Amino acid sequence: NPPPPETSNPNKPKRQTNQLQYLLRVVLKTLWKHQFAWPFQQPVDAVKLNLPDYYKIIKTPMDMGTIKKRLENNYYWNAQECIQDFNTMFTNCYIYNKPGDDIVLMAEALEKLFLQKINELPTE
Amino acid sequence: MYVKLISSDGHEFIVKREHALTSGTIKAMLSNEVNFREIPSHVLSKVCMYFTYKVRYTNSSTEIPEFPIAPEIALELLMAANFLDC
Amino acid sequence: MDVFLMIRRHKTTIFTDAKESSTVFELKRIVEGILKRPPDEQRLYKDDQLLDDGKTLGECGFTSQTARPQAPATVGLAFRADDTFEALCIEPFSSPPELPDVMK
Amino acid sequence: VLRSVNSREPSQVIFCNRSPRVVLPVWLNFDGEPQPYPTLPPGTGRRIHSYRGHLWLFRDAGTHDGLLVNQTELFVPSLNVDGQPIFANITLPVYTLKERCLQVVRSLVKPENYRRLDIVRSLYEDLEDHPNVQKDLERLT
Numbered sequence: 001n002p003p004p005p006e007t008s009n010p011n012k013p014k015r016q017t018n019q020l021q022y023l024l025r026v027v028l029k030t031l032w033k034h035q036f037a038w039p040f041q042q043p044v045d046a047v048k049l050n051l052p053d054y055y056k057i058i059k060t061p062m063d064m065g066t067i068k069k070r071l072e073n074n075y076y077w078n079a080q081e082c083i084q085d086f087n088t089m090f091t092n093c094y095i096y097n098k099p100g101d102d103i104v105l106m107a108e109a110l111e112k113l114f115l116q117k118i119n120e121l122p123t124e
Numbered sequence: 125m126y127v128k129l130i131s132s133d134g135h136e137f138i139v140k141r142e143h144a145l146t147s148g149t150i151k152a153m154l155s156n157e158v159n160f161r162e163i164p165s166h167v168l169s170k171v172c173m174y175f176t177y178k179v180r181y182t183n184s185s186t187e188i189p190e191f192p193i194a195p196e197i198a199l200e201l202l203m204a205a206n207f208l209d210c
Numbered sequence: 211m212d213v214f215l216m217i218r219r220h221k222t223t224i225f226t227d228a229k230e231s232s233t234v235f236e237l238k239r240i241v242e243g244i245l246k247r248p249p250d251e252q253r254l255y256k257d258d259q260l261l262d263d264g265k266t267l268g269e270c271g272f273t274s275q276t277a278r279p280q281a282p283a284t285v286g287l288a289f290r291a292d293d294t295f296e297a298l299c300i301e302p303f304s305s306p307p308e309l310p311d312v313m314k
Numbered sequence: 315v316l317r318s319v320n321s322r323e324p325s326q327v328i329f330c331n332r333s334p335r336v337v338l339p340v341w342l343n344f345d346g347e348p349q350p351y352p353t354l355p356p357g358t359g360r361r362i363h364s365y366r367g368h369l370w371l372f373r374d375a376g377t378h379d380g381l382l383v384n385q386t387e388l389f390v391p392s393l394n395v396d397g398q399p400i401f402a403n404i405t406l407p408v409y410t411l412k413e414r415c416l417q418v419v420r421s422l423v424k425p426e427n428y429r430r431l432d433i434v435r436s437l438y439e440d441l442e443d444h445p446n447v448q449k450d451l452e453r454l455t
């Protein structure tokens with residue numbers, strides 16, 4: 001497995017907003033405790049799972065552990081930067097796996113929940 | 125082999141003794157007729173339905189259906205089930 | 211196929227099962243065993259419709275899907291009263307309270 | 315005590331939901347940890363590639379009420395005799411009327427409003443004792 005995505009950068013401006021706090025304390029917390037969270041809380045272990053092509057095909061891996069650590073480290077500039085990371089995590093799953101694999105259904109349930117929560121984001 | 129269970133409002137419910145023994149309270153009381161001054165007929169009729177359901181679907185086959193409970197009777201039914209020990 | 215019933219008259223409710231192939235007469239025999247009145251002294255009803263003794267419960271519309279243990283079908287009962295049958299009269303059960311606002 | 319064995323010996327299983335509930339199949343991993351799998355709508359079934367020694371339990375996806383598989387709590391598939399798949403029939407238990415009533419009240423009342431209900435003190439403790447996989451796993455041992 002390659003090194004996971006960075007979750008803190010001296011060269012990247014750090015920032016805290018009320019939307020980024022909501023994304024951590026409400027959205028991430030709810031999704032992290034979800035029944036279908038468990039394959040997405042850590043980077044894809046291509047070694048244990050025997051997926052060689054995974055990190056060859058998926059050039060921008062993302063997981064909820066990385067997003068959580070990023071939120072916690074004030075890594076994101078704004079909410080959209082964080083939401084893009086969640087989207088990438090889901091999109092990676094839809095790209096690599098065929099339709100109607102169990103993992104794709106779990107991602108679809110998390111994403112449906114994610115969109116609902118994000119629909120009630122308080123404004124800047 | 126029947127028992128008569130009379131609700132607080134005077135309705136009489138005649139059920140098989142075997143079915144009424146589903147209640148641990150009724151089983152202890154009978155250890156003919158049982159009056160319940162605190163259980164109304166809309167609740168006691170539903171308890172009797174549960175007795176039939178429990179006897180029919182206990183160990184008797186696969187595919188158990190749901191016992192339905194309307195929101196309106198739920199709290200009173202809960203209090204009766206708690207007292208009757210079934 | 212068993213059909214689960216509530217035979218009701220006034221403030222009396224009998225909980226009893228029967229086959230779909232069993233007759234209305236066979237149900238009157240059940241009633242006679244409990245309430246000590248012969249079949250000729252009884253009138254059985256589905257809603258306001260008088261049921262014929264020789265009809266099977268299935269022919270009367272009582273199925274297993276519609277007469278379940280947890281939701282039994284109601285059979286109205288009227289007894290003989292002197293020179294005529296009494297009017298079918300089923301006293302309604304008590305009413306639940308208003309649904310609390312903490313539930314609604 | 316309660317975990318899957320890492321056998322890597324494939325075993326085809328048929329999950330069949332013969333309950334009126336939505337089923338959450340829960341796979342207990344090699345460390346005993348519950349790893350829920352995609353749900354089964356009432357009256358539906360799915361073939362799954364599982365393995366010998368893998369241990370499963372089945373819950374109501376919305377309330378975490380315990381369900382039965384082959385008339386018991388746990389399911390561990392054997393090796394397929396002549397390729398024929400192993401059947402996991404999921405059903406409702408015959409809950410007690412009091413547990414069924416607790417389930418219904420819990421589904422209508424938010425946990426913070428339990429103590430606003432005109433019921434006895436002991437019924438508050440019963441409502442707040444939500445059905446839960448970790449609680450049930452300790453008892454099963």
Ligand SMILES: Cc1cc([C@H](C(=O)N2C[C@H](O)C[C@H]2C(=O)N[C@@H](CC(=O)NCCCCNC(=O)C[C@@H]2N=C(c3ccc(Cl)cc3)c3c(sc(C)c3C)-n3c(C)nnc32)c2ccc(-c3scnc3C)cc2)C(C)C)on1
Binds near residue numbers: 043101
């Ligand atoms: C040996 C051995 C193997 C096992 C376990 C195992 O196989 N188990 C445990 C239980 O006994 C059940 C069984 C199992 O999951 N069988 C699954 C495997 C599966 O669907 N994988 C996706 C295919 C793409 C293949 N590619 C991938 O693996 C993609 C990868 N999948 C998953 C993934 C896939 C499925 C599910 Cl439900 C959850 C996560 C994944 C991650 S990260 C992560 C931590 C995991 C595990 N992931 C993310 C994120 N994005 N993609 C993925 C299965 C389910 C249904 C079927 C069938 S057969 C006919 N119709 C169907 C649908 C066939 C297989 C193992 C899961 C630990 O134990 N011992």
